Design a binder for this molecule. Structure first.
Ligand code: GH3
Ligand code: GH3
Ligand code: MG
Ligand code: MG
Length: 862
DNA sequence: CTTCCTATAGTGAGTCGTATTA
DNA sequence: TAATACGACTCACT
């Protein structure tokens, strides 16, 4: 390991020496400096900005040590937070916070004082340790190198995109150790809060508020950034200038993996990376000794995927985002969102002010979301304008306990349209014909044209030619590209399809082409049992037409809608003539007879029968569809004036769900049956056992354990947290008692462990198929670039073909020699359950559909 | 039971009883 | 001595 081997005096030397060694030197320094950028503000970097962080940063810095006095002078006990806040350079303590705080804020969802603090406290610890190493490394990567100019130049402009090396030369000094927080979540809270606390005193940046008090279930405290700053983030460009996510790209090939920790970043002065983001220590420790070469090589290749900033897009990106009315509504405007003032009168509770409590909160619920999506945008935009030039930039990868592959950089190619459109590769090659074709294809996919045969897609392109004959020239005028489902990503194409015609099929192209199936997981299910209609629905079959699984269930459910629209039942009795009004909720259970008549009045298309579908891969039944169909289509409908027919909503919601669950239950029959099967295994395999009365017991609730195709092990270990609260006199005002979970539990939550065993095993696959994919595709068709998004594996226009094919070749080959369902069993037959065994088997019946029919499946790429 | 994972996480004022320090 | 900062416990919560 790193430590125990050499004294910290040099642990910060090896990384730099080795770095400067390959690649270059100029780029070597900027690297660890960059990595450092996620801990403390550059003394020089700062003096260079001569606008926003500039103001907040110092005010905070001061307050930090300034607070250390107030505490040092006082007698009595000292605020715990302090106890470990002192031995830490304040110039960092402040910086972390701002960012880390601004970071969390970018989450329109969880902004609860819990999260932030977690996020802050973590970093602080991430600096508490690696203290000197984080510093001494600087004094080191500061001094020049050992002579040499030529080879020290950095790359000699040699356009060859330097490739990383191997564990060989890799000095044992560059590894990883305990990448898990050593502090107790309890204390980690004291720190952040206190940080936050002092961030408030110093800078008013963000304020804390009591969200929906007295609400025993939805009661919590969150921090909402102050307007001032918010306002100077939509207008004042580069506002977050010096602000950079605690994780940024790299302008050099990343440090290859070979262990549970020790990858992505080089700088041994920071926090190590976890190959598998495990919600625990032990879980990750299991992954130590695995002997799973296929897993590593896979990620190693993905990580070594060089990226370039789409200089053209950016050019317009940061431009329009500052327009009062941007052609992209997906962009949080800069204008202020008013609201319907008090409804004429004042003291009334009919349906006006009664519903006003929910007719006015929309703005109080949206002003919070906008600021989110905006703070986010400004982030991706800074990094862009930041690396805009950088020759090449890599993204480090990680994977959840399930396998799925995530990029570590917050500015990952796995983000929104803006973000993706602003990315591209570099090792491109003269697209040629094969590519040009798919290029025009990718244009359509993005153009929202994914419901038709390729021939009709390409057609779509040639048809809208002149539509681009000016879009790529003066987009600032050609507001057409900003209409397609993904304008940004589309534009990127508009800029290629334009030049490809200015240079010919010789026109090199680095733009990655995206390939996404019809409905992942559901595709894999129909693959491990061969659901005849299943694959045919998830387009997995060599169909001649685009089978919209979502749309089939529409007409399908629509069919049953006409049924109950003729007979069904009838408006059941109210709830009047009774004893003493025991239950007056809904004085009419209505009937399926009039229900269909309401739906047929709304339309019911693929829309409604959408979410409820995919979600099925996560565990969505008729119970769940109620809420979905409601808030997704019913609830909002009426909250817009329409939906004037839905007299009793909740009921109608129970109606469609009903219809829905049916329509699919018989379609993707394999999926459900499979899940129910899985969902059945866990239970009697998760819940402990006892004995013939008395009380004695034997088998202890074993943690889910099985192995993926490529070899990636995995455990569910869905333990049950043991929470508690703290007492914190926040800002000498009140007492903030945080309810937090203790990262030292041991108990396990069966229930969940159950409802999750199935839906997880899914991704585990469609996330494992992927690895094998890229690997095979690497050695098979010598591929290097991969713009994969869990199920959207992409590559250069020329590597399209090999990819488009390779995916199948794996999906098949894999679910062929391998038997997920079966294998899983063998993974516990004896290891897990002992006696009984029975009243649980009932293997799922297989279907007749040779997987080779996939190698030719035109659609359903994934 | 009732929508996976990029992890999470009911709140604050009363009232006390302890180590801990200037 | 006498002043801190807080875990522990317990209610009522629009
Ligand atoms: N694992 C996972 N991936 C998701 C989920 N939602 C979307 N994705 C994938 O990540 C991609 C981008 O996700 P986000 O950046 O989180 O959402 P978004 O698509 O930008 O939505 P919006 O434009 O309205 O901001 C799109 C898709 O490939 C999700 O819940 N889980
Ligand atoms: N794990 C997970 N993945 C999601 C979730 N929502 C979306 N995704 C992933 O991101 C993908 C985005 O799909 P959409 O573009 O929203 O729909 P679609 O099914 O592709 O069909 P279409 O574009 O024609 O409407 C689908 C899926 O693989 C989610 O809640 N959880
Ligand atoms: Mg979203
Ligand atoms: Mg998809």
């Amino acid at each position: 390991i790193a430590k125990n081997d050499f004294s910290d005096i040099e642990l910060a030397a090896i990384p730099f020496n080795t770095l400067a060694d390959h690649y270059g030197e100029r780029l070597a320094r900027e690297q660890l400096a960059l990595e450092h950028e996620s801990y403390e503000m550059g003394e020089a970097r700062f003096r260079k900005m001569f606008p926003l962080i500039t103001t907040l940063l110092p005010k905070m810095i001061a307050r930090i040590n300034d607070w250390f006095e107030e505490v040092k002078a006082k007698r009595g006990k000292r605020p715990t937070a302090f106890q470990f806040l002192q031995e830490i350079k304040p110039e960092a303590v402040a910086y972390i916070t701002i960012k880390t705080t601004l970071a969390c804020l970018t989450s329109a969802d969880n902004t609860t004082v819990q999260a932030v603090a977690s996020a802050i406290g973590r970093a602080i610890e991430d600096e508490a340790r690696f203290g000197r190493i984080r510093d001494l490394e600087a004094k080191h990567f500061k001094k020049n190198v050992e002579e040499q100019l030529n080879k020290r130049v950095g790359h000699v402009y040699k356009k060859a995109f330097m490739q990383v090396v191997e564990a060989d030369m890799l000095s044992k000094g560059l590894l990883g150790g305990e990448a898990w927080s050593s502090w107790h979540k309890e204390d980690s809270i004291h720190v952040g809060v206190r940080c936050i606390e002092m961030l408030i005193e110093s800078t008013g940046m963000v304020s804390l508020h009591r969200q929906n008090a007295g609400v025993v279930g939805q009661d919590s405290e969150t921090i909402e950034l102050a307007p001032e700053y918010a306002e100077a983030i939509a207008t004042r460009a580069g506002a977050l200038a010096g602000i950079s996510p605690m994780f940024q790209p790299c302008v050099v090939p990343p440090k290859p993996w070979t262990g549970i920790t020790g990858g992505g970043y080089w700088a041994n002065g920071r926090r190590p990376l976890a190959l598998v983001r495990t919600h625990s220590k032990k879980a990750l420790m299991r992954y130590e000794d695995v002997y799973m070469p296929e897993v590593y090589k896979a990620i190693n290749i993905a990580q070594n995927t060089a990226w370039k900033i789409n200089k053209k897009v950016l050019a317009v990106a940061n431009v329009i985002t500052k327009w009062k009315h941007c052609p992209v509504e997906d962009i949080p405007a800069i204008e202020r969102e008013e609201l319907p003032m008090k409804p004429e009168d004042i003291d009334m509770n009919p349906e006006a002010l009664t519903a006003w409590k929910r007719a006015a909160a929309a703005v109080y619920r949206k002003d919070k979301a906008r600021k989110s999506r905006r703070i986010s945008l400004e982030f991706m935009l800074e990094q862009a304008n930041k690396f805009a030039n950088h020759k090449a930039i890599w993204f480090p990868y990680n994977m959840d306990w399930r396998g799925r592959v995530y990029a570590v950089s917050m500015f990952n190619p796995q983000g929104n349209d803006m973000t993706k459109g602003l990315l591209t590769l570099a090792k491109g090659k003269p697209i040629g014909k094969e590519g040009y074709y798919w290029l025009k294809i990718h244009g359509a996919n993005c153009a929202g044209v994914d419901k038709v045969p390729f021939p009709e897609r390409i057609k779509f392109i040639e048809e809208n030619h002149e539509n681009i004959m000016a879009c790529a020239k003066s987009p600032l005028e050609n507001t057409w590209w900003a209409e397609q489902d993904s304008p940004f990503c589309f534009l990127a194409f508009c800029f290629e399809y334009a030049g490809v015609q200015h240079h010919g099929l010789s026109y090199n192209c680095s733009l990655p082409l995206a390939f996404d199936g019809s409905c992942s997981g559901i595709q894999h299910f129909s693959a491990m049992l061969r659901d005849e209609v299943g694959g045919r629905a998830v387009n997995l079959l060599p169909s001649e037409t685009v089978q919209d699984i979502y749309g089939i269930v529409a007409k399908k459910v629509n069919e049953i809608l006409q049924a109950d629209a003729i007979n069904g039942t009838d408006n059941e009795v109210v709830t009047v003539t009774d004893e003493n009004t025991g239950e007056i909720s809904e004085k009419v259970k209505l009937g399926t007879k009039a229900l269909a008549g309401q739906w047929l009045a709304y339309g019911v298309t693929r829309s409604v029968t959408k979410r409820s579908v995919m979600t099925l891969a996560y565990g969505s039944k008729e119970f769940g569809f109620r809420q979905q169909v409601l808030e997704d289509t019913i609830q909002p409908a009426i909250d817009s004036g329409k939906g004037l027919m839905f007299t009793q909503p909740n009921q109608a919601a129970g109606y469609m769900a009903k219809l829905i669950w049916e329509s699919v239950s018989v379609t993707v029959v394999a999926a459900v049956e499979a899940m129910n099967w899985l969902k059945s295994a866990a239970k009697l395999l998760a819940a402990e056992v006892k004995d013939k009365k008395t009380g004695e017991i034997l088998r202890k609730r074993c943690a889910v354990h099985w192995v993926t195709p490529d070899g990636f092990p995995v455990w569910q270990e869905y333990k049950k947290p043991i929470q508690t609260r703290l007492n914190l006199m926040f800002l000498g005002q009140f007492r903030l008692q945080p309810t937090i979970n203790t990262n030292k539990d041991s108990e396990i939550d069966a229930h969940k462990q159950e409802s999750g065993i199935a839906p997880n095993f899914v991704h585990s696959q469609d996330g494992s198929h992927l690895r094998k994919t890229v690997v095979w595709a690497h050695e098979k068709y010598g591929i290097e670039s991969f713009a994969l998004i869990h199920d959207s594996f992409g590559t250069i226009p020329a590597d399209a073909a090999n990819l488009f094919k390779a995916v199948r070749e794996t999906m098949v080959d894999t679910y062929e020699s391998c038997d997920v369902l079966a294998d899983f069993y063998d993974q516990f037959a004896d290891q897990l359950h002992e006696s009984q065994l029975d009243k649980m088997p009932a293997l799922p019946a297989k279907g007749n559909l040779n997987l080779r029919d996939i190698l030719e499946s035109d659609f359903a790429f994934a």
